[PDB]
Fold Steroid C26-monooxygenase.
Amino acid sequence: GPSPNLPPGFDFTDPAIYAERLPVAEFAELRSAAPIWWNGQDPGKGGGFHDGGFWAITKLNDVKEISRHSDVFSSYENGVIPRFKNDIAREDIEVQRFVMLNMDAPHHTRLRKIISRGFTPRAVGRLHDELQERAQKIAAEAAAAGSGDFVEQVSCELPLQAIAGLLGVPQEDRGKLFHWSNEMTGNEDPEYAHIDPKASSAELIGYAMKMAEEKAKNPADDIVTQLIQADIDGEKLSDDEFGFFVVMLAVAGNETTRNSITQGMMAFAEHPDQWELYKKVRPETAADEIVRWATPVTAFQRTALRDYELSGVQIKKGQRVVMFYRSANFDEEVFQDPFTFNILRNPNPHVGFGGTGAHYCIGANLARMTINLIFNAVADHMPDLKPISAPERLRSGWLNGIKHWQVDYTG
Ligand code: HEM
Ligand SMILES: c1cc(-c2ccc3c(ccn3CCN3CCNCC3)c2)ccn1
């Protein structure tokens, strides 16, 4: 059929778009007119990739199919982040292969089994009561300030405390853990231009290796002991593997949940009836509708290891496919009224945590718990909050971020 009605050279990974808005109409145009579409990229404008473009994947069933066929659609070959600075050196993409998100089977399989021996429902539930306390204190301190930046005073801290609690980081070390975690989220936005994620990653690995050595001597009620203790087959994270796991957790556990919280509250501010309902019933289905609405990871990619036909389109060996979770999470064929914010939506088969498959978010239930606990505290302590001014968005080609959002907590 006809080509989609998009500006010439439009690139769905263009960070300049996301600094200002989400390209919702443009994704909807692809879903209607070209649901798998070649996103050409001019020379040097590939965000670190120099292959002329990628396939934009906009439908939820195609996202699931790619996520399920990890034997064809590789994470390792080019990593899963689809956009860096245009001049990033290839070696700096490939160094990301040392974290489990960017590996393939069998290396991925071994690492995930280890990381899931201690990253369990029991381990996550053991954090509930401390995170609930922490959420209530966060919302109370914010309410006591009267007004301020919702991102920094409400959204930022609880995800970081969840990472610290899961790893057993002593309170005296949490400040520098949080600092490293914030540094690692990138430097593509002018506000963050001076951050050095490479150096912070190196500092975190050093910290984590020391922790691994200490905790081997003195086991404790954290997941760490389960990770570095050999099983029957002698399987365990090496000290440097634990280091790369901590890097993985420090980055993955921070900005995505933060941005869920900020955008969830933005949604409630635009849909006051859903906010009234939330405050009365406190439904935990809210968390998934908030992750669907927020889609904190706009997109992750894969690389085809062989020719593969996907929904009538021929994907060729070596081509990238980019899974636009932001489009799939609003797919009219899967969701009833996707552009309605409905905190009781159930079932809610969103792909905010990725498609079912080998790389499905191991932190999904921790994130959901974090979200439910912070929104209960917000409802308890600042039920009448109202925004002062517009959110400031983050310049990124794949993360959907809110840097700042001024709010009057007393309303
Ligand atoms: C709302 C919050 C979050 C969102 C939107 C989110 C999103 C995602 C997505 C889309 C993936 C799929 C990776 C792929 O298929 O290439 C993923 C994987 C992953 N997430 Fe999350 N995530 C969240 C929170 C967390 C938290 C809190 C943690 C850890 C405490 C975490 C750790 C991980 C890890 C380690 C993986 C990689 C798993 C593997 O490669 O086997 N995430 N996440
Ligand atoms: C899964 C994954 C993530 C996730 C993974 C990586 C992530 C972030 C945020 C930043 N990075 C890394 C940034 N890249 C490019 C810029 N240079 C440094 C390296 C989140 C979250 C949840 N679940």
User: Anything to note?
Assistant: The domain at 15-404 is CATH 1.10.630.10 (Cytochrome p450). The chain has one domain: 15-404. Residues 197-217 form the longest helix (21 residues). The two ends are 51 Å apart (CA to CA).
